[PDB]
Amino acid sequence: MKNKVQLITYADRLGDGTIKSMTDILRTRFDGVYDGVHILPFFTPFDGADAGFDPIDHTKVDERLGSWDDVAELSKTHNIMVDAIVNHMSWESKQFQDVLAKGEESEYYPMFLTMSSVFPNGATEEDLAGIYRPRPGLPFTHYKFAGKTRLVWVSFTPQQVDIDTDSDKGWEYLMSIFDQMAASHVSYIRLDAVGYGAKEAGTSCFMTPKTFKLISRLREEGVKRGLEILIEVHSYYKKQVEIASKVDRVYDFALPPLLLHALSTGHVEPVAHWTDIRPNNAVTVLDTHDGIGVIDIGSDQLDRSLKGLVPDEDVDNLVNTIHANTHGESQAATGAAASNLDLYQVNSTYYSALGCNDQHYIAARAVQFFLPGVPQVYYVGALAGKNDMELLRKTNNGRDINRHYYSTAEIDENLKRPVVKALNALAKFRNELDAFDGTFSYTTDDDTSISFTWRGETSQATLTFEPKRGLGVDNTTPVAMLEWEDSAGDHRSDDLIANPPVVA
Amino acid sequence: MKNKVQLITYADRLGDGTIKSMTDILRTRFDGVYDGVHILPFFTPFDGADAGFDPIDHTKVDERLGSWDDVAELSKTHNIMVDAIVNHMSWESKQFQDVLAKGEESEYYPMFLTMSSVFPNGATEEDLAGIYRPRPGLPFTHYKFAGKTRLVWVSFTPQQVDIDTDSDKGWEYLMSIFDQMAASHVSYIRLDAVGYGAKEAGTSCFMTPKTFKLISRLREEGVKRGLEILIEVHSYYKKQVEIASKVDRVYDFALPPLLLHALSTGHVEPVAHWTDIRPNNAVTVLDTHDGIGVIDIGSDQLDRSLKGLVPDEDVDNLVNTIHANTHGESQAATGAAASNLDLYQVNSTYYSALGCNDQHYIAARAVQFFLPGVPQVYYVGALAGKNDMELLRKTNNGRDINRHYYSTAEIDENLKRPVVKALNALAKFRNELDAFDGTFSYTTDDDTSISFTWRGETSQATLTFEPKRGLGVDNTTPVAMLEWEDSAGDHRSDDLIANPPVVA
């Protein structure tokens, strides 16, 4: 994976509404800033039950957004990452509709999981209560197969029916997706919700050895097609650490909340510890298209004796701090407060989670960019966006608070903001200084500060992060300083917003 | 049960917000209009997860609303109906909390239903898939009993934990409720969601023979205490017809949608047929505190070959007509559009469902009052209230569209409206003419009109209902005429709004 900053975006929420428009925005407003892009699900349809993650036809671009040729055109200037939704599909798919109509007489009957598919001889309370769930309630919903009521396995919305990834029909479907991407100039594949892909009676059905087998098989199929794979796994941190050695890349989901913790409390020890044990074959982020994950650093939900990267007390304080910083906005969008698929992810834009503090935000991005891994910036964060309460009101979908629709006009106005210019400059710096393609090292001043250093072919840079320099949502004191050497001398910025770094 | 019109109301949504104020409003604004009252759950708390139906302490009046003394005061002038929430209680109740803390060591462990309680030897998909549900999804949620994750039975919100009505502790609790009501001057008891009260592996767990046993046992306890029982059952109409012979009263839930059908299409034959087979030991309504039930007249949900009171196409047209008449308001509050416990009830005030046609509305009330049974008028309907979109957008609870908070000031403002004056006059008429305590008969002019007649000791009255006279939400032609004889001779009203009937 090219070691350049990538943008995560919906094709219709950045620009006029199409892949063409999104491409124009990338090329004319973010040239040299974002050299790659993860286009969130743009298949048919992109506006269903779960904003693209419930595809009727995963291999067909929603014609309202564009075509595969638009993706091909985009590939000329940007490396592209696309999702491979391997765990489920829309109940409106031709395949599932056939099952509803013909039941067991459907050739697609084996393609979908039902309670009986996994528990042919029935299940005890323990069996069902043991299935890992990101929210309360069992992963089953009612559907009539040729008139007979059946309990179909559904990990997320009831409209997303889980497929049997070990069935012939299911595997054929997954390979059709891989073939399409390999033929459409896609460079990277994001295995969506892969941790749920394998079901087995008596197990948690989440990140088990059976799941590892699925992941390994999918990786092999990727290799055969020249595709690198990134897996999405929101879990107890140790599961991320263990699975990372088996895949090209994993997301670093611990950093986002660890930084919110550090910026709010001034404690950097947790960040130092994570730097020491974290998987380095990562894709770093602050914000994603979902809510801010907190169980990603807390204790194991299935076994609380296994503590996280910080005490659960600190996770709870972190959550309340976000609610405080957003003046209740995140409280109105999180968990049971609105429509959500995850009870604990905190729904809020990252900028709003920090109380819109520019110095804290640019510092968080700086730390993200300095940790080993390919960095990704979510489009809302790329424009330092605030919570969209109007969108939340309209849809009542918790995550929409962090999914604002940015018109071209709004993008241009936001590009004038000091913090946005600062981020564009920082990303450009991260793409142009060759130090980042060299060796990494770090030192820490006992829970007070941490310095990240990169030494490359013709340059080097050291980022010093000291949150205690500017606690408070109204803080204007920089909490990160950057020293670097390039072909044009030895430089230093003590304020990434007033003095953004520029490579000679 | 006295054969006088009753009002259904929340103690805090009619007046200043207390039982005392609600009482004052009844006595000073509705004297002679509403002689009885069903006070919706006013226990601790009244503003929890399901507006009173998730009690922490069913025997304690919420201190913010008043006290049992206030109920005693009210009883001096009005017969009171109160709910006996026999199927579940709040998860915040002392009993359930004790179970969460001590698990099996809690003396209340047997009081609550879990998957294992009902399925001790495990369950097959068929066992679980067959459980009747008013909406998709299994009736279970996760709770930790002394650290151990358990699947607790929850028919409605996850906060309303179902009790084992067959357990000693469960029965003791239910009897504590009956005892409290008998000691607090309550006259009538409404058995809330009693149809769900009995669970048995292999059955639908809804209105089954085991359910009948529970209903019969509860009726006996009511009889022993001098309390009459009304059971709430939303189901295929035949279930209501059959259970009626075993209880004092059942609700007439078929009439509301049948009248919407009659008023929108002009067809009265369905009403004639229902008049012929309906249980006459009923409590009649148009609107309730919940949504308008339509499966109450449609085909059976389990076996669709068991037809309803009108063709399925007509039920579908009825639903679409309500959504159309409210210009999308009811669609925004119904089903998966908002938080709901029932997927098919249509959330809209009855007046709004009729496109606010006064003549249609007063005619519907006249028919309601002319069919055998004790009439109840929901407070929103008592004030011919329109959909409350302001409240709906604030709570996102679908049923709130039909739960407006009426200040005393707003009540007086609405009492000036001709349609509201007409309803007050009609209810008074229904309470003063002794014809309604006499013999009932009816004639019909083949699907065009139906005339209901009551002949009493010193009076007689005939209501002629003919929707065809004035179809359309915008029509001003009366669709009901009333003729009657009292001590002052023969009388006639050809417009219940312009010329309300007054007993001489």
UniProtKB/Swiss-Prot annotation, chains A, B:
GO molecular function: sucrose phosphorylase activity
UniProt keywords, alphabetically: Carbohydrate metabolism, Glycosyltransferase, Transferase
Effect listed in the UniProt record for changing E232Q: Loss of catalytic activity
Protein name per UniProt: Sucrose phosphorylase
Enzyme Commission no: 2.4.1.7
Any one GO biological process: carbohydrate metabolic process
UniProt-listed Pfam families: Alpha-amylase, Suc_Porlyase_C
Role noted for this protein: Catalyzes the reversible phosphorolysis of sucrose into alpha-D-glucose 1-phosphate (Glc1P) and D-fructose. Is involved in sucrose degradation. Also displays transglucosylation activity in vitro, by transferring the glucosyl moiety of Glc1P to a broad range of monomeric sugars, such as D- and L-arabinose, D- and L-arabitol, and xylitol.
Catalyzed chemical reaction(s): sucrose + phosphate = D-fructose + alpha-D-glucose 1-phosphate
CDD domains: AmyAc_Sucrose_phosphorylase
Residues the entry annotates as binding sucrose: H88, R190, L191, D192, E232, H289, D290, D342, L343, Y344, Q345, R399
Subunit relationships: Homodimer.
Gene3D superfamilies: alpha-Amylases (2.20.220.10), Glycosidases (3.20.20.80), Oligo-1,6-glucosidase, Domain 2 (3.90.400.10)
UniProt record similarity statement: Belongs to the glycosyl hydrolase 13 family. Sucrose phosphorylase subfamily.
Impact upon substituting Q345F: Decreases affinity for sucrose. Highly improves in vitro activity towards aromatic acceptors, allowing efficient glucosylation of resveratrol, (+)-catechin and (-)-epicatechin
Gene for this chain: sucP
pH dependence: Optimum pH is 6.0-6.5 for the phosphorolysis of sucrose.
